């Protein structure tokens, strides 16, 4: 059961004497036992993709054929750790080796075996009680926040024969057993699941509840849904990573799984250094945000093939936690890197390029990655509800949104956040374009936003109208030179300037806009729209009769009120009370009303 | 260790461009170094690339010319490319391949190291925080650089980036002020003789030759060696960073020539292309080069890196600058408009970027309002450029007052903030005082970005 390395070139090798083999079967190569995978074959020859540096491998080295395709281990202890692209626990490696490198072909299990997790019985089962796939028969407390829950694997069912009592056990101790049809099979705390296979689910349900967002923009103007899709393409210098981190820190989701791909090392250094300090409570004590976050690091240098594995691994973990009834939120970084890794690999096989060298099937691969999402009714008796949201970050080469990868992405996603490098040159954080972006989910959420607020639709519509009309007037004021302006035109242009500078701008590090909840957004938009309405009504009435009000007149009338209006954003809601800011904005509206009455 | 004798060969199945193919090889090893003896007795080397069956392929480093099948001899060593490294290498000169130039002897080595190095574990990475004093206000003040950073410098043909690099070397230090210094390794990627003379003389001038290792590859040398030289220099840097606990600064120059050499070597194999004909995996290769930098837990040294590249035809979408902009976390963008106005040092700020500033500065590092000054100054600069572009059409009559304020701000800021001089080295606090001197021109009721508090406590004076 050993092949021999016929050839080697790049990360693609060849092995003869492998007639008894199958595609996508893992494989160990060389004396370091680098993990691999099968892609092609011809007779008793085969082609092995290698997930590790090939330097030093020699012809004729033994190659061990294993008995399973690519798989990922699931169970307690996954939370809070950081894994590389094929799921080696990095912290275990650094502890074991006492070094600062990653030796090639290091073999350490995905999870630890020498830890005793507390276990609780089902409290509802007995000897001879029948279950099926996806039924919970155990609860283990990883920590105060997230209570792990062990379910029977899919494709298994039967009447139980032994249940372990409550107490502290490790993985290796057999927990459950059962007979189905005269065969007794034992279940541990560990599931092994093929990575490229979807976890079955009862039924996909329609979306029913939105997804909170940190930033002021991209929340009112382009909402997201609890289970939907979103994309953030944009040229460099624009910093998609800041938005990704901001979303990661501040969101109502129960688990966050932030998969990096080809990222910078310093960015993972940010994440590791920074998340543990931030904290938040739910039903008592305050606990660090690291206690609800699982990371999958994969920086640029790491072997090219591993980039493929990492993304699939991450989404698989997301689905596994989805089978618990949580609301997972996932953050993919630079899927363009994944596409480019696939491009390189397919290049070294001597296959057909399709579009800019990208193989044809990348569109299908991308679509398959995203379609595993959405809110779903789960499979199991206890009747759990959960969802998975996916927000991926594309990196078009140079900002050209006609490149193949963005073109394939725009057809499949539902929400799109175009970003503009000019704004990022202005440091207009976040540098979103607000004119080519869109989001098809507005219609499904209007019902919610009415069942809570009922006073947002006019605000949004008027904001879109004013911005659109400003953009139309941009050409007319550019060519003319700001002379051929009726007073309403100047009013809309300058109120558009104020909304762009005030509501749209937001700093992503200063304490007072690290986070901004929805109500403040509503308050600010209401203030600005009301001011627009009053200004135009006054100017209309004074235009038709006599003494047409120029914009300079209202400016000199209430520049102080304008200054207060803009400085509204200095609040830091964390300390100050909500009703206090509501009364503050009501007071500013009172000031505006008084000024307009005095001018009236 | 290995006592196996080294086989020699006489099999040359055939030549095709820069490749040399061998046959009847007993167990070749991927990426093993091989020496070649030509009929004339002169010597060369190479590295295996593709192996299949008993056949193998060998990239020649010195350029293939004069290879005869029946008289050449191909000696094999049986290991990857491995280099000698020693602390005393500082204060020497070497060519691209590593052989001495300065009439000295080869390096008695303290250890052998892998040319490619090997990835560092992200968990044991101490994020860089400590700030460096460059002196240039366009960096300290706008795009500050902390040790461990790997920011590049973008230039164009016929621009004085060499002067900027030399000055950066001269005035490097620590803003927070035993006497600390630097150990600088410098590698050249096809510079002309004039550049080499300039850099060598400059390092001679300030007495810093005692602590600089040099790597020089003029255009005379065969292009294939340009692939290896960077990784060799970078390996030396890593040794001095983690085995001697020194603080090191790296300066690779004209990586555009490196990209050209990469294109040349790739075209021999007929790999798949990308934009402008470069290899697709060129991105991953540049990543293999650039990333090797930063500070690691449990140590004391650190690696800073300052690559320099020219922009062909000033086209910023060109693949080399783009992929550099993806990998590294910043840019500088030397301007040529200022060079046409005869200004020194002519550095644009509007497209420059420094990702590490968000933690480089703050209270207890430089000053309380360091970020605010930066934000407001950039904003005024941007609106000033916009107002100039507007003035180019409408005429002076259409200008409102704030246009005049922005234009005088633009002029004053350009002649004051940017212009420093060949050796003027401003302190950081002097730079902030000057920045506030430029901010005070505007009335306080227009500096939107700055918080109200900072304006209250600092603006009136």
């Amino acid at each position: 059961t050993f092949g021999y390395v016929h050839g080697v070139s790049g990360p693609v090798v060849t092995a003869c004497d492998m007639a008894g083999a199958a595609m996508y079967e893992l494989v160990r190569v060389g004396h370091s036992e680098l993990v691999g995978e099968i892609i092609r074959l011809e007779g008793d020859m085969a082609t092995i993709q290698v997930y590790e540096e090939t330097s030093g491998v020699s012809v004729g080295d033994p190659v061990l054929r294993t008995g399973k395709p690519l798989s990922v281990e699931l169970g307690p202890g996954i939370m809070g750790a950081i894994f590389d692209g094929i799921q080696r626990p990095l912290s275990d490696i650094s502890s074991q080796t006492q070094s600062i490198y990653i030796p090639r072909g290091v073999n350490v299990s995905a999870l630890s075996r020498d830890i005793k997790w507390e276990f609780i019985p089902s409290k509802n089962l007995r000897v001879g009680s029948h279950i099926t796939g996806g039924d919970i028969y155990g609860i283990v407390n990883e920590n105060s926040l997230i209570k792990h829950k062990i379910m029977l694997p899919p494709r298994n069912r039967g009447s139980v024969t032994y249940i372990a009592p409550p107490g502290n056990y490790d993985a290796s101790d057999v927990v459950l057993e059962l007979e189905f049809e005269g065969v007794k099979e034992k279940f541990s705390m560990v599931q092994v699941w093929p990575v490229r296979q979807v976890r079955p689910v009862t039924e996909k349900l329609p979306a029913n509840h939105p997804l909170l967002t940190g930033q002021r923009v991209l929340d009112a103007l382009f909402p997201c849904v609890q289970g939907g899709t979103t994309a953030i393409p944009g040229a460099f210098g624009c910093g998609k990573t800041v938005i990704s981190q901001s979303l990661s820190k501040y969101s109502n989701s129960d688990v966050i799984i932030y998969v990096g791909c080809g990222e910078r090392g310093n960015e993972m250094s940010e994440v590791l250094r920074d998340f543990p300090e931030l904290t938040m409570e739910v039903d008592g004590k305050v606990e660090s945000i690291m206690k609800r976050t699982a990371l999958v690091a994969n920086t640029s240098n790491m072997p090219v093939a591993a980039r493929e594995a990492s993304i699939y691994t991450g989404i698989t973990l997301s689905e596994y936690f989805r089978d618990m009834g949580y609301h997972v939120s996932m953050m993919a970084d630079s899927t363009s890197r994944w596409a480019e890794a696939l491009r390189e690999i397919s290049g070294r096989l001597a296959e057909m390029p399709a579009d800019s060298g990208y193989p044809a099937y990348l569109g299908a691969r991308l679509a398959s990655f995203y379609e595993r999402a959405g809110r779903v009714k789960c499979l199991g008796n206890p009747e759990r509800e959960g969802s998975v949201s996916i927000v991926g970050a594309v990196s078009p080469p140079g900002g050209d949104f006609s490149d193949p990868v963005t073109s394939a992405t725009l057809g499949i996603v539902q929400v799109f956040w175009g970003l503009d490098k000019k704004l990022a040159q202005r440091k207009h954080f976040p540098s979103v374009n607000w004119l080519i972006s869109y989001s098809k989910y507005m219609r499904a959420l209007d019902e919610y936003y009415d069942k809570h607020f009922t006073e947002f639709v006019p605000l949004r519509t008027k904001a879109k109208e004013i911005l659109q009309e400003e953009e139309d007037l941009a050409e007319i004021v550019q060519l003319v030179g700001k002379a051929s302006l009726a007073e309403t035109d100047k009013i809309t242009l300058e109120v558009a300037k104020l909304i762009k500078d005030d509501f749209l701008q937001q700093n992503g590090y200063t304490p007072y806009d690290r986070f901004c909840p929805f109500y403040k957004t509503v308050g600010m938009l209401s203030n600005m729209i009301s001011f627009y309405d009053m200004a135009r009504r006054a100017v209309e009435t004074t235009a038709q009769s006599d003494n047409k009000i120029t914009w300079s007149i209202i400016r000199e009338h209430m520049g102080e009120i304008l200054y207060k209006l803009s400085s509204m954003k200095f609040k830091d809601p964390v300390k100050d009370g909500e009703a206090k800011i509501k009364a503050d904005y009501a007071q500013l509206l009172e000031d505006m009303q008084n000024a307009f009455r005095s001018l009236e | 260790y290995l006592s196996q004798p080294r086989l020699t060969y006489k099999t040359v199945s055939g030549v095709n461009g820069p490749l040399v193919i061998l046959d009847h090889v007993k167990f070749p090893r991927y990426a093993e170094i091989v020496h070649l003896t030509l009929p004339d007795g002169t010597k060369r080397s190479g590295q295996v690339l593709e192996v299949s069956g008993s056949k193998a392929v060998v990239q020649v480093f010195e350029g293939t010319s004069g290879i005869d099948a029946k008289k050449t001899s191909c000696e094999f060593t049986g290991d990857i490319l491995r280099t000698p490294v020693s602390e005393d290498m500082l204060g020497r000169v070497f060519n691209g391949s590593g052989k001495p130039i300065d009439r000295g002897p080869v390096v008695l080595a303290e250890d052998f190291l892998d040319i490619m190095g090997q990835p560092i574990n992200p968990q044991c990475r101490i994020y860089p925080e400590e700030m460096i004093q460059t002196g240039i206000s366009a960096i300290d003040g706008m795009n500050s650089i902390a040790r461990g950073q790997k920011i590049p410098i973008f230039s164009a043909a016929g621009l004085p980036h060499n002067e900027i690099a030399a000055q950066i070397c001269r005035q490097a230090g620590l803003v927070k002020k035993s006497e600390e210094n630097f150990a600088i390794v410098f590698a050249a990627m096809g510079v002309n003789m004039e550049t080499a003379r300039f850099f060598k003389s400059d390092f001679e001038e300030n007495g810093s030759m005692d602590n600089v290792c040099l790597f020089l590859n003029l255009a005379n040398d065969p292009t294939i060696e340009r692939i290896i030289t960077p990784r060799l220099a970078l390996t030396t840097a890593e040794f001095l960073a983690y085995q001697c606990e020194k603080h090191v600064l790296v300066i690779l120059t004209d990586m555009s020539s490196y990209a050209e050499a990469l294109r040349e070597v790739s075209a021999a194999r007929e790999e798949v292309p990308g934009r402008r004909g470069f290899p697709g995996y060129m991105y991953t290769d540049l990543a293999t080069i650039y990333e090797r930098a930063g500070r690691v837990e449990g140590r004391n040294g650190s690696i800073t890196q300052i690559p320099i590249l020219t922009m062909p035809n000033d086209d910023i979408t060109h693949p080399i600058p783009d992929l550099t902009g993806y990998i590294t976390e910043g840019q500088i963008y030397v301007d040529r408009q200022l060079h046409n106005r005869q200004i020194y040092p002519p550095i644009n700020v509007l497209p420059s970027l420094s990702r590490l500033m968000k933690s480089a500065i703050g209270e207890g590092m430089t000053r309380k309002d360091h970020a605010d000054v930066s934000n407001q100054l950039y904003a005024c600069y941007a609106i000033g450029k916009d107002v100039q572009a507007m003035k180019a059409v409408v005429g002076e009559e259409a200008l409102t007052s704030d246009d005049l304020l922005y234009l005088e701000f633009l002029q004053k800021f350009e002649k004051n903030f940017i212009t420093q001089g060949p050796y003027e080295n401003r302190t950081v606090y002097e730079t902030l005082d000057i920045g506030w001197q430029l901010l005070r021109i505007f009335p306080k009721e227009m500096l939107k970005r700055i918080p109200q508090s900072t304006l209250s406590e600092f603006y009136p004076r």
């Binding site: 001597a350 057909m352 390029p353 | 007929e270 798949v272 292309p273």
Partner: peptide, 13 residues
Amino acid sequence: FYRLKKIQEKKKI
């Protein structure tokens, strides 16, 4: 151009 070249090369076998 390149893809045609690769067809040409493949046809040699």
